């Protein structure tokens, strides 16, 4: 049961430095190649790098030739990405890809599969804002949180720490005139559990390490 | 680098219909010797990284659906699902790993079309804490409907707003292949408690005529 797992985004000042990482399970991992793909906001998919099973060898894209290393830990079952002189154009969601059969020449010239879940890297001069999160208070009624004021992407929104997922809408954040994202993360419940049950918005912005639970109870 | 080109951006079609999407690339990426063409295809549902459909331009990857289906050789590529189903739903890429660096196409949006739902509408009002730091936001929610087309508009005291308003709408679903909408209104704490009456507008296909919900304070 191949597993990517990827970590390490953030916000970064332009000039500025960032290291990825990607953690692997369920394969013997020095036995395949890894590749880094990006996936700009208004561009498309653009591979980065890659690396053999051993690290031996590596490849990379000319826009991030000499900017970005690639490495690997065929312990720690790790691959890296260090980014250094980061640029605005760099922001993207980050992915870290698996070569199916091996270890292809050059390293990268192959499909993948599979790919990790992303990481978002935002490079901007932009401070960090975290979130303030309000209730949005209610046979079935709906209830949520609105996140606002952010900067810069993502928040994450579970629901009573991961206990309810049925119903939930989480949208896409909205950019405000302020340079600050917002967005809200409703449900839907039945209306005679209002009462009893208890529903808190678990709101998770980790450029700012700003983890806010919030009560969200009738008026 | 080699491009790879998708036709079309995006297109919608219905539930057990055939949905065709197109790739070229800027040169053959066909290897004569080998009788291999180095094209694969890819699935990025909602919030999920991309899957492989098609390797080799025409093989379909292992748990991948008979329904799905990859042709074409040299330059022009075709990416084939009969019998669509809801869960569909996604930006399909295609890419050439015929030399590096391997190129992808700019993607290609596959919309669901299913029976006409009428939105659910919600209205909230401004929570006591937001209204202390000099802010309301009043939210409006549209739930579970389809088509994506609907008008939401803002009254304050029966007066049309215009400008103070903005909308997100969620990727459709991957099981009932509906959508959701919020309106969030923004006004000055002032300007919140010059008026009385908050109402919210909803004009959908889904719906005979237009629905309202309101709030008072
Ligand atoms: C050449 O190969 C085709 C199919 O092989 C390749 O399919 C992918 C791997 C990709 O690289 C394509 O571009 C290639 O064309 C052979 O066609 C198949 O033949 C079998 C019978 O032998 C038939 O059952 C399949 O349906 C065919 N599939 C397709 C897609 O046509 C073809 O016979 C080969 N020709 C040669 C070796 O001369």
């Known amino acids: 049961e191949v597993q990517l797992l990827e970590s390490g985004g953030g916000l970064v000042q332009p000039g500025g430095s960032l290291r990825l990482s990607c953690g692997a399970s369920?394969?013997?991992?020095?036995?395949?190649?890894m590749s880094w793909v990006r996936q700009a906001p208004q561009k498309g998919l653009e591979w980065v790098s890659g690396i053999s099973g051993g690290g031996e060898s590596t490849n990379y894209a000319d826009s991030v030739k000499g900017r970005f290393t690639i490495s690997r830990d065929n312990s720690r079952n790790t691959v890296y990405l260090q980014m250094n002189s980061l640029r605005a154009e760099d922001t993207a969601i980050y992915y870290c890809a698996k070569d199916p059969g091996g270890d292809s020449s050059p390293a990268g010239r192959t499909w993948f599969d599979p790919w990790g879940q992303g990481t978002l890297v935002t490079v901007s001069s932009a401070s960090t804002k975290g979130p303030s999160v309000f209730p949005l208070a209610p046979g079935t009624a709906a209830l949520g949180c609105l996140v606002k004021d952010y900067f810069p992407e993502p928040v994450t929104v579970s629901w009573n720490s991961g206990a309810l997922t049925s119903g939930v809408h989480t949208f896409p954040a909205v950019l405000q005139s302020s340079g600050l994202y917002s967005l809200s993360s409703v449900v839907t419940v039945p209306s005679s559990s209002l009462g009893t049950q208890t529903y808190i918005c678990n709101v998770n912005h980790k450029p700012s390490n700003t983890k806010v639970d919030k009560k969200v109870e009738p008026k | 680098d080699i491009v790879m080109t998708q036709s079309p951006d995006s297109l919608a079609v219905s539930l057990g219909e055939r949905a065709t999407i197109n790739c070229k690339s800027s040169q053959s990426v066909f290897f004569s010797s080998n009788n291999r063409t180095y094209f694969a295809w890819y699935q990025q549902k909602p919030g999920q990284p991309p899957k492989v459909l098609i390797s080799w331009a025409s093989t379909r990857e292992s748990g991948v659906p008979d329904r799905f289906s990859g042709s074409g050789s040299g330059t022009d590529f075709t990416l084939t699902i009969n019998s669509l189903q809801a869960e569909d739903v996604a930006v399909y890429f295609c890419?050439?790993?015929?030399?590096?660096?391997?190129?992808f196409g700019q993607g290609t949006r596959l919309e669901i079309k299913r029976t006409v739902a009428a939105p659910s509408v919600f209205i909230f009002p401004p929570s006591d804490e937001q209204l202390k730091s000099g802010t309301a936001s009043v939210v409006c929610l549209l739930n579970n409907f389809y088509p994506r087309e609907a008008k939401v508009q803002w009254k304050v005291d029966n007066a049309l707003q215009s400008g103070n308003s903005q909308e997100s709408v969620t990727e459709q679903d991957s099981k009932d292949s509906t959508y959701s909408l919020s309106s969030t209104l923004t006004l000055s704490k002032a300007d919140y408690e010059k008026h009385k009456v908050y109402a919210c507008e909803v004009t959908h296909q889904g719906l005979s005529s237009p629905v309202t919900k309101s709030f008072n304070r």
């Open positions: 369920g394969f013997i991992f020095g036995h395949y190649a």
């Open positions: 890419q050439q790993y015929y030399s590096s660096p391997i190129t």
